[PDB]
Symmetry: D2
Subunit: 283 residues, 4 copies
Amino acid sequence: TMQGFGVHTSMWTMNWDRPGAERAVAAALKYEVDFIEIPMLNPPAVDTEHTRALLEKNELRALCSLGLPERAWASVRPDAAIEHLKVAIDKTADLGGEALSGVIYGGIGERTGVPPTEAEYDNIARVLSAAAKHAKSRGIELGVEAVNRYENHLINTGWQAVQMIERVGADNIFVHLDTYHMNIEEKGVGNGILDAREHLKYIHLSESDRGTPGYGTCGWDEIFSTLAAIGFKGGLAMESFINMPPEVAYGLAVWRPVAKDEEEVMGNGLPFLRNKAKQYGLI
Amino acid sequence: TMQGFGVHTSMWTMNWDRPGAERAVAAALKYEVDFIEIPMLNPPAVDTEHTRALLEKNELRALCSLGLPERAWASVRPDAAIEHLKVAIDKTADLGGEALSGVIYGGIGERTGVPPTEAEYDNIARVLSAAAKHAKSRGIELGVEAVNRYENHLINTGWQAVQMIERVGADNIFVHLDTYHMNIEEKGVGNGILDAREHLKYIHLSESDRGTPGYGTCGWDEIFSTLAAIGFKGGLAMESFINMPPEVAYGLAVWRPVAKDEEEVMGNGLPFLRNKAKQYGLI
Amino acid sequence: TMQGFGVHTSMWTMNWDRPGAERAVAAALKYEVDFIEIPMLNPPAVDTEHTRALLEKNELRALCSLGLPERAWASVRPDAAIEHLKVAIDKTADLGGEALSGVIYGGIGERTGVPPTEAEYDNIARVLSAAAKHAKSRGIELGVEAVNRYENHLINTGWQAVQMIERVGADNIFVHLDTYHMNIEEKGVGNGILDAREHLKYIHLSESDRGTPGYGTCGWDEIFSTLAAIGFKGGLAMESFINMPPEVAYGLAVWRPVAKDEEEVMGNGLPFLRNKAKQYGLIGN
Amino acid sequence: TMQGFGVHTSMWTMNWDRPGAERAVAAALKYEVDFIEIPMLNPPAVDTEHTRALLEKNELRALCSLGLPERAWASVRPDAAIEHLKVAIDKTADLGGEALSGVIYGGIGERTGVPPTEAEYDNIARVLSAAAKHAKSRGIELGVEAVNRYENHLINTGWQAVQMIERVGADNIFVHLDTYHMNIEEKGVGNGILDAREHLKYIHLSESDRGTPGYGTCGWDEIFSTLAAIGFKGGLAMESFINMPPEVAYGLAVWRPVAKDEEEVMGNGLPFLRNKAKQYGLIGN
Ligand SMILES: O=C(CO)[C@@H](O)[C@H](O)[C@H](O)CO
Ligand SMILES: O=C(CO)[C@@H](O)[C@H](O)[C@H](O)CO
Ligand SMILES: [Mg+2]
Ligand SMILES: [Mg+2]
Ligand SMILES: [Mg+2]
Ligand SMILES: [Mg+2]
């Protein structure tokens, strides 16, 4: 159950191969973070032994995240989804990760053009119920990330995520919020935190344009005050799309640079967020 | 246990004589509030039975507030402070009030030019302990309002108010915050609410210039989100200095109109605050 | 050029057919707005005489907006775009509208999957240059609306929109910003207004979730102070998708109600916005 | 005249004695600011030639500010006030300072208990007109700082400061705003900047509790967007009362530490403010 400050390793690696894992872990140490979030674009290819050894040796905690590929979108292909999640759960457990989070209930790019249906939600609950069983067997939790309306039409708000967790009735699925998505979806950004308060264990601290935290439109004081007020003790994960590989960036609608360089994003954004977390007593 | 929305009657009445009480109660009904806060500038002159019958007839709840006059400033004249507060506490209870709140520990205009001393605080604590016993005997609570540095040098922040409540050791003293004061004093406005969370039962929703809520510098989204997040269930009291009698106005450094007219303040401010309360789930 | 307060008619009707025009115009008058913004999504279907009669009878001004259908996306099918824009311009002018604005350079839901290219912009400029000549012939101006990265890949910021206006070199194209889009795209919302100031004549005061203004994440105090500071004097227009025009639903991505109903958005959002304009002393208030 | 970033020297010393100036100038160069604001609260104690030598060898600009002592409040004792200002003006000029700003029209802590009267403003205008001519004699400008209702009852807003400037009619008096004070007095912080835009040459970027900028309640994005929008090009100065000059402690009301220490305020506040000025494209950053 993640605690403290971490970073999504997108800024150094989206391909978690051997040199990529090395590079990301090194950056994590340079910035003195408490954990890393490992994107698993291709869970089969991950060398669990190498990553486990790296995390243990540097006393770094980790969790993993993914989005389901189209061949495995839970809403329409629930059997493939369960298969894909079971592989990723095993990989996360093996490398020492404490959770698999993200868009584990569908894909980036899902859109029917109409509101989400009970049939879609039924398939998703089937998938999550099975994956949660499997995750319990490996000693990890699952995280359901609310993302904005353009990426997925099924779970966009903290309240929708909580409704899905109530539908599944498991005890090892938590809510994962992202300030970039909440900046679009939440009716006042604090309401996403309020609505998920009983299940919120992880939040991406990401600026409104995916650039440098502190230098966009996210309401950071409301965000941090509300996290402190609900007693949030989970993971604070800085995320920025700076230096993302072009192929991955284009898929997430990055048509232009989100910030100047890593020096700008990490050198201004990370102190901003740590200072805010101290200011409001999260630490 | 004050609940819901109310108004400080200074917008219609600072002199709580018979016609003043009638006028304020009439306004309260028009704006459909749940309670009124009655300023008690001259507690001996209050007709308790008239006001009690007005409140019971109109299903309206009430609390009273005051600041201590200089002859009874608790920090330096605690015996006179106790005598003054007993009179106000009895009048408050006799009229049907549920609490006496405000600057019950000192006065507007206290300033030594140096930090508050332990001797000052010892005198305040003795006064408030005697007052709390007297209040307990009449079935009411006391509220300690944090006010800004220019009005009083002793209790300016939520954390300072809680400290005094802990020094006193009574269980019937609560913290009373005011967004106008917090806008100056709190290191991020939500931190006053967070620091006071265990004892917070009343908040003045006042704009940064004492004018129209919604049209100043107060961070309303952070305020309401943090209230909701700490589970606040006490009194939400609108306060504006519009139409205050000039003698009282000048005493609080109102050197110019805070707003056009009551129509602006109540017509724009009260909907703004009620809409925010609904937005963040306080209602 | 538009002044005062207005409303995008999705507040009141899905389509600009005859009963939709009757309903929207009646609602607009109830709220004492100065103008309405009418979607030009099915030009051959618009009964221009019926709408112009309604507008002139009730002393309501209007402009139109659209997104281009994929058959006529300017970036890839510029000749189809020109023809489509000429029809939309003529219908806009025939009903008495004073400008045609919005995503007039592409689709709502347009994306190639890669960043925008010079070849795409070269085509858009050709299209807008031809369209702006046609608009001038009918006495109306054109507006280019910056929309967020998920709705179009070509013009997302005030500075991009201004670069397109500079690339075209016309005298009758303005910039149209939208607080909902700037909430995503601008590095500090005021920056979109600053970057666009020389050409900004129309702004959608749309809440961050397309809901009720004042009850989302938009930085309204920053928005209004910056509009006042640059001396904005064009149209202030609400946009809340209480009703969703079918031809743009897929791209606008409203999958759940933006608010309880039109009464809530108009009854709470419009007074908030009018009160903010007065607070910051906006020209015309 | 003043450009770029600067710091009120209460950041580093309580008094402007010889050792205090050693320290402040040293710090100012550690943080690579462009200027310092020196309190002229104790003129007979200021070694002007020593400070002036430090400023030139360290390539550092300066201005001074003050509040008037009660014996010389321009409101009630105008002839005293003129004499006090001429001395403060002369010593400011002697040490290399380019303006004398602040509460030059009254006391920090001045109040009558009643709203300001026309007689009071008459006296202030007479004082400032006299003072302004003496200031021109020495080649420096005067600044009128709006402060909050609890520190002075006469000039609390941008608009009031402009009205006093327009009354005096002098070419060499600017408006000085302070975000700490505007946080209380302005009905929307950007309105103070808007109202003062024709005369605004200096702003204190001071947090709402006089602590670390970025970590209080000031609406920084609105502040910086509005400064960019009006084309602000004057001094951007920090003010945090780590140290408190004794002459003004009673009126400034710092009864507890504003922040952990100077390292926290400068180490977190200055990068925040520099980053914001760049974010909004402020002239010179
Ligand atoms: O804000 C937008 C695009 O997201 C709309 O203004 C669009 O141009 C309009 O709906 C067409 O009528
Ligand atoms: O902001 C203020 C007044 O509160 C100060 O700038 C004051 O004028 C200065 O301390 C005098 O040097
Ligand atoms: Mg995320
Ligand atoms: Mg109060
Ligand atoms: Mg729009
Ligand atoms: Mg100042």
